[PDB]
Structure formats: structure tokens, C-alpha cells
Amino acid sequence: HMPAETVRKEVALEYCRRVNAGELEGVLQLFAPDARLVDPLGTEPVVGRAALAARLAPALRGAVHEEPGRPYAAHDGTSVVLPATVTVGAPGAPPQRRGRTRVMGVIEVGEDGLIREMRVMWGVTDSSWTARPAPDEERRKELAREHCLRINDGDVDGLLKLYSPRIRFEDPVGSWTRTGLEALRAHATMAVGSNVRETAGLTVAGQDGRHAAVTVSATMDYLPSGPLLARHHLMTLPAPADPHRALIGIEYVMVIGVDADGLIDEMRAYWGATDVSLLDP
Ligand SMILES: CC[C@@H](C(=O)N1C(=O)O[C@@H](c2ccccc2)[C@H]1C)[C@H]1O[C@](CC)([C@H]2CC[C@](CC)([C@H](C)O)O2)C[C@@H]1C
Ligand code: NA
């Protein structure tokens, strides 16, 4: 039996706390012995505690500081996503030569609560270490926001133009994969019919020429989603007295992957029961 959503959220924030405390050993104890770290996306994984120590020690020596945002869960018993800002320099650099990077970390926690995998999404356009251009990263972050805009405008035909016929999507992570534009059309049609509104917060790109992610605050009519969420352990609040007036709120992170033609061919949404609220009335 897998760690509760709130426990996985605790582990993600604890990682930041132990990094911040400068505790190399303490940090390492949070990871499984054979854990994998990918940072940034589009690099070889670091594998195992010896390798992780080699990777983290220089950052600890550079007084790395991590300022976490809000964590998001999933319905897979394992995943959690944490936006953060990370500041660091060479050992003993003044603030002048410390760079700051916006990231979103994806962690997969084991049954015992230890981190099995960590993938860190951030692009050059998310970091003060460089002003080099990366038009592709910007394009992908824009596409993530454009999804929300088209849903909000009720423009299902428009939304589908962003997507590949080969689109695989999963909502929430830990459900199942749906394939194809007609499935996306049905999902989007249900969203629009439920008065879904998707308000985007923060974006980051991955450095793999493929990924981007956006934080989203959504609302929608309590019916029909609420009773379905309740039945599948995704809404643990009491039912509203009048389901016809109530709204559901969901905080999530949407990760997208973009193909060789600039179309979105992968989409995942990270949220769980602890990310779901009820606006009643
Ligand atoms: C049936 C539809 C809904 C849905 O998938 N699910 C659901 O109820 O129950 C989940 C579920 C999961 C496992 C088992 C059974 C049910 C899942 C299928 C959700 O889908 C919506 C509306 C289309 C969209 C809007 C934004 C977004 C993220 C919140 C995502 C980026 O599309 O989800 C919100 C709605 C709660
Ligand atoms: Na930059």
C-alpha cells in the first residue's frame, strides 16, 4: 500500500528542507538506494546514492537554496510534482554571481516513502544563468497556455489544432491513457459542457526539445464530475447540499510533449484528491 498523497507531498517538501539545511547524508536517506535522478531532462540519469552524492555535493558546497511552491499529487500512489525556485553559485559566490532557476520537479515515491525517481523540468529560458535564446522552449510554454485559452473560449475545434492525431493523454496521472483526436474532442466537449475554466499560473520548459509544464487552477460545475470523483476516491469532501449551485476546483500541473512537427502528442495532468476542492455555493 502506497503512500498517501499528503505523505508524498511531505517527502517532496522535505527534500527541499534537507537540501536547504546543507545535510548531504540527510538528503541521501530520502532516496531509495538505487534511485534515479534526471536533471535536466535530456540527460543520462544519475543512478544510486554514490552517484547522487557526487551530483549534489557541489550544489551543497555552493549554498544551494530551494524555495518550494505548492505540491501536486496524482492518482498513481507514487507521483508528486513540486514547482520551486532554485538559487545557487560556485562555493562562496556573492548574490551577484548566484543564478536563480524556476523548476518543476517530478518525484516518484516507493511503497516505503523513499524517492525512487526525480526528474527536474527547467529550461534556459527559466534561468537567470543565461540570456541565450531558446525559441523552442518559449513555443512549448506558449502551447501549454494556449490549451487553457482554447478550453476557456469553448473552442474545441481550435484546441484540437494544437494536437497530433497520435496524441496520448492521461488525466489524472494514474488513470489510463486515451489516444487520438476524437477522444480528446469528447473529453474537451465534456469540459466545455461543464463550464470548465482553466487559469494558468507558472510555466517551465524541459531541456529535451519536447516537454513543457504549466500550473493550472480550474473550476467546473459540480455535476457531472463530482459524484464520479467521489466514487473513485478523488473527492473526499462532503457532497454539497445543492449540487446544482456548487463548483469543483482542481489545482493541477499539465505536462505536454511536442513532436517533430510542433504538435502536442503527449499530455498528462497531475492532480489527486488533495488537489480537489468544493466551492459551495
Ligand atoms: C470525466 C472527466 C474528468 C476525469 O478525467 N476523471 C474523472 O472525473 O474521474 C477520474 C478517474 C480516475 C481514475 C478512475 C476513475 C475516474 C478521471 C477519469 C476530469 O476531466 C476534466 C473535465 C473534462 C478535465 C479539465 C482539466 C483537466 C485537469 C483537471 C485536464 C487537463 O483535461 O481535466 C476535469 C474532470 C474532473
Ligand atoms: Na535564461
Side-chain angles (χ1 to χ4, degrees):
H1 204 99
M2 290 299 298
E5 296 176 25
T6 200
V7 176
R8 302 200 310 266
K9 290 181 166 174
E10 188 285 338
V11 166
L13 294 166
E14 185 65 14
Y15 168 83
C16 290
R17 283 186 285 270
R18 297 201 194 176
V19 162
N20 286 342
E23 276 176 54
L24 179 62
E25 188 54 54
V27 176
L28 294 171
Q29 290 301 328
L30 301 180
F31 291 82
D34 56 338
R36 304 167 83 79
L37 167 68
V38 181
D39 172 28
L41 298 196
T43 65
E44 178 173 275
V46 179
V47 186
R49 282 176 187 168
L52 289 172
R55 171 70 80 88
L56 283 146
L60 295 187
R61 284 198 291 281
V64 61
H65 181 83
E66 303 199 3
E67 187 75 31
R70 178 194 191 288
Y72 298 79
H75 197 50
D76 65 358
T78 186
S79 300
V80 50
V81 184
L82 180 56
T85 295
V86 181
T87 303
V88 70
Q96 304 165 348
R97 290 197 306 280
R98 284 165 68 82
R100 178 155 82 208
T101 308
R102 172 58 76 177
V103 306
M104 295 191 200
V106 180
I107 286 93
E108 295 180 17
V109 185
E111 198 187 317
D112 60 1
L114 304 181
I115 298 168
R116 295 188 80 203
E117 186 155 308
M118 176 177 287
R119 303 180 302 273
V120 192
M121 199 183 319
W122 71 276
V124 298
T125 66
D126 299 317
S127 182
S128 87
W129 282 115
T130 193
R132 76 176 188 90
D136 69 304
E137 288 188 9
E138 285 299 343
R139 183 180 186 271
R140 299 198 292 282
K141 295 186 277 186
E142 289 161 26
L143 286 178
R145 297 184 185 273
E146 185 72 15
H147 173 120
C148 306
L149 297 177
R150 295 184 182 199
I151 289 290
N152 293 338
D153 201 35
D155 182 14
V156 180
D157 291 343
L159 178 73
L160 297 185
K161 294 177 165 31
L162 303 176
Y163 283 89
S164 173
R166 295 178 288 284
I167 174 61
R168 294 169 51 93
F169 65 102
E170 173 177 15
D171 177 25
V173 170
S175 58
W176 47 86
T177 297
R178 299 79 151 163
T179 303
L181 288 168
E182 296 308 297
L184 183 60
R185 177 190 310 276
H187 179 82
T189 294
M190 189 269 150
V192 175
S194 273
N195 302 122
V196 165
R197 299 288 183 272
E198 293 172 9
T199 298
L202 301 171
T203 49
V204 296
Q207 280 177 62
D208 58 359
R210 186 163 160 76
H211 291 97
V214 58
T215 67
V216 183
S217 183
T219 61
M220 65 206 70
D221 291 345
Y222 179 78
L223 302 175
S225 290
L228 298 180
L229 295 177
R231 176 139 46 186
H232 290 96
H233 314 107
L234 282 170
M235 202 286 294
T236 61
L237 298 89
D242 185 350
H244 284 294
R245 287 158 76 261
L247 299 177
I248 295 163
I250 305 185
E251 305 291 305
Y252 65 92
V253 172
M254 178 178 73
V255 174
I256 63 169
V258 176
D259 70 14
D261 290 320
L263 292 173
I264 304 170
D265 69 355
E266 171 194 338
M267 186 272 273
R268 306 193 290 291
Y270 291 84
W271 53 281
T274 62
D275 301 311
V276 177
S277 296
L278 170 81
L279 303 72
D280 176 21

